[PDB]
């Protein structure tokens, strides 16, 4: 669910900067990306495309796709490394189908791990024996994991 604007406002009488009414080409709309498609005045090949509805709808679809792409790529805290089948962990020793080929595959229903394998992200510090055999100096430190059974401030001790 998203509440941002997707469609373009339709063509009508020339709007004025009033209450509940913005002009058809304003710098506030679409981050000012309507500056490419505006006419400041209150050559036919450069004037006809600014008034076509399919053209401006395709342009705002391209801009919303660019926004969706940059927000999906800013989510990435990982990268894809091609690891051989032998050194991979046990959850990836299966036949993983391609994208949109089969049902979204659970990770391990027998070991009570019901999650998508395509969204699984593995830590870099647990694969240093696989990714870095040539260093031999332990370039990344081991991850300190907290003792869940230790009496701490969380358990009123």
């Amino acid at each position: 669910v998203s509440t941002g604007e997707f469609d373009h406002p339709p063509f009508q009488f020339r709007q004025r900067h009033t209450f509940n009414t913005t002009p058809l080409h304003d710098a506030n709309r679409f981050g000012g990306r309507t500056a490419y498609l505006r006419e400041i005045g209150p050559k036919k090949q450069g004037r006809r495309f600014k008034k076509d509805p399919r053209t401006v709808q395709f342009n705002v679809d391209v801009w919303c796709a660019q926004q969706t792409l940059r927000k999906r790529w800013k989510q990435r805290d990982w990268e894809v490394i091609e690891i051989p089948f032998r050194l991979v962990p046990r959850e990836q020793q299966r036949v993983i189908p391609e994208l949109y080929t089969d049902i979204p595959q659970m990770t391990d229903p027998a070991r009570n791990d019901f999650s998508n394998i395509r969204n699984k992200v593995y830590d870099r510090e647990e694969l240093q024996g696989v990714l870095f055999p040539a260093a031999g100096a332990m370039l990344y430190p081991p991850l300190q994991r907290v003792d869940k059974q230790a009496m701490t401030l969380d358990k009123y001790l």
């Binding site: 004025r16 900067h17 009033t18 209450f19 002009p23 304003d26 710098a27 506030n28």
Partner: peptide
């Protein structure tokens, strides 16, 4: 404010 254009005044009964 990012609305710096010239505006059109409206009577308060229409608002």
């Amino acid at each position: 404010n990012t609305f710096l254009t010239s505006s059109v005044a409206t009577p308060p009964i229409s608002v």
